[PDB]
Design a protein around this motif. Structure first.
Motif, PDB file in Angstrom:
ATOM      1  N   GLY A  27       0.836  -1.194  -0.168  1.00 50.13           N
ATOM      2  CA  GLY A  27       0.103   0.014   0.038  1.00 50.13           C
ATOM      3  C   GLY A  27       0.823   1.439   0.023  1.00 50.13           C
ATOM      4  N   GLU A  28       2.177   1.295  -0.013  1.00 51.99           N
ATOM      5  CA  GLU A  28       2.882   2.544   0.212  1.00 51.99           C
ATOM      6  C   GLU A  28       4.291   2.150  -0.570  1.00 51.99           C
ATOM      7  N   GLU A  29       4.910   3.316  -0.898  1.00 52.69           N
ATOM      8  CA  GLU A  29       6.084   3.255  -1.528  1.00 52.69           C
ATOM      9  C   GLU A  29       7.155   3.683  -0.335  1.00 52.69           C
ATOM     10  N   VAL A  30       8.512   3.363  -0.461  1.00 54.85           N
ATOM     11  CA  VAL A  30       9.597   3.787   0.319  1.00 54.85           C
ATOM     12  C   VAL A  30      10.548   4.496  -0.379  1.00 54.85           C
ATOM     13  N   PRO A  31      10.641   5.762  -0.311  1.00 52.22           N
ATOM     14  CA  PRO A  31      11.540   6.497  -0.939  1.00 52.22           C
ATOM     15  C   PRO A  31      13.062   6.287  -0.649  1.00 52.22           C
ATOM     16  N   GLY A  32      13.788   6.433  -1.623  1.00 54.52           N
ATOM     17  CA  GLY A  32      15.335   6.301  -1.722  1.00 54.52           C
ATOM     18  C   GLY A  32      15.801   5.107  -1.776  1.00 54.52           C
ATOM     19  N   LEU A  33      14.918   4.046  -1.917  1.00 56.74           N
ATOM     20  CA  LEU A  33      15.211   2.771  -1.896  1.00 56.74           C
ATOM     21  C   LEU A  33      14.789   1.900  -3.003  1.00 56.74           C
ATOM     22  N   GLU A 124      16.096  13.340   4.161  1.00 51.60           N
ATOM     23  CA  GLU A 124      14.741  12.513   4.695  1.00 51.60           C
ATOM     24  C   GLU A 124      14.809  11.115   4.126  1.00 51.60           C
ATOM     25  N   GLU A 125      15.462  10.778   2.833  1.00 59.20           N
ATOM     26  CA  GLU A 125      15.537   9.655   2.462  1.00 59.20           C
ATOM     27  C   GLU A 125      16.576   8.706   3.480  1.00 59.20           C
ATOM     28  N   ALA A 126      17.578   9.469   4.006  1.00 58.18           N
ATOM     29  CA  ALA A 126      18.708   9.024   4.861  1.00 58.18           C
ATOM     30  C   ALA A 126      18.310   8.119   5.903  1.00 58.18           C
ATOM     31  N   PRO A 127      17.277   8.531   6.931  1.00 58.64           N
ATOM     32  CA  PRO A 127      16.869   7.740   8.131  1.00 58.64           C
ATOM     33  C   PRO A 127      16.044   6.585   7.302  1.00 58.64           C
ATOM     34  N   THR A 128      15.297   6.941   6.451  1.00 59.43           N
ATOM     35  CA  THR A 128      14.264   5.962   5.836  1.00 59.43           C
ATOM     36  C   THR A 128      15.165   4.947   5.275  1.00 59.43           C
ATOM     37  N   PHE A 129      16.468   5.093   4.867  1.00 55.28           N
ATOM     38  CA  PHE A 129      17.272   3.881   4.331  1.00 55.28           C
ATOM     39  C   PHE A 129      17.711   2.827   5.483  1.00 55.28           C
TER      40      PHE A 129
END
Length: 188
Positions: A27-33, A124-129
């Motif tokens: 249901g969702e995308e994960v940015p940066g990855l 913001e993509e950094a902690p998401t990684f």
């Protein structure tokens, strides 16, 4: 040819000739990855010295079952890239690697020379990684291409639903995205 080069090794983790999809979870995308699909293609393995898998196929047919076509993931390719596996070590070297990995990824994010507001989004993509890598951490099989090292080019992989091979886990915005096309040019 767009290729993703790891910041630690400088080696090719995947190219646009292989499967590259932005991480889309339930249901969702994960940015940066980006996550890499598994697609099983006939590999010319031969099975002369190493019988890969070695399984008797009962399902399918009975007397029409002569198959010399090893189906393996196009991204891994034993006769081409050849991914060597690494087990959970959880050892100090590995933990030091995790530190320097995120460190140098965050340095690549800095060295990109991107505009300030876009840097904010990049960061913001950094902690998401980090978060998303930790989320699959316990199910990871570690890989390296044969040209890679455990300290440089240690690839995360796991097996999700639909994947009949290791699903390769990569950091989209964290690697050196080298786009090969304009080699000899002078853009002014």
């Amino acid at each position: 040819m767009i290729v993703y080069k790891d910041v630690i090794s400088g080696d090719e983790v995947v190219s646009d000739a292989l499967k590259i999809t932005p991480v889309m979870e339930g249901g969702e995308e994960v940015p940066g990855l980006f996550e890499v699909d598994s697609a099983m293609v006939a590999v010319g393995g031969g099975d002369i010295d190493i019988g890969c898998g070695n399984a008797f196929g009962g399902a399918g047919d009975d007397e029409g079952a002569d198959d010399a076509t090893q189906k393996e993931n196009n991204v891994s390719g034993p006769s081409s890239f050849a991914y060597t596996a690494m087990p959970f070590s959880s050892k100090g070297e590995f933990k030091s690697w995790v530190k320097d990995y995120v460190r140098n990824v965050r340095q690549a994010l800095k060295g990109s020379g991107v505009a300030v507001e876009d840097i904010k989004k990049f960061m913001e993509e950094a902690p998401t990684f980090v978060k998303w890598l930790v989320d699959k951490y316990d199910d990871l099989e570690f890989f390296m291409s044969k040209s890679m090292n455990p300290d440089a080019g240690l690839i995360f992989s796991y097996y999700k639903e639909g994947a009949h091979c290791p699903t390769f886990v990569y950091v989209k915005s964290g690697y050196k995205v080298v786009k090969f096309l304009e080699h000899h040019h002078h853009h002014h």
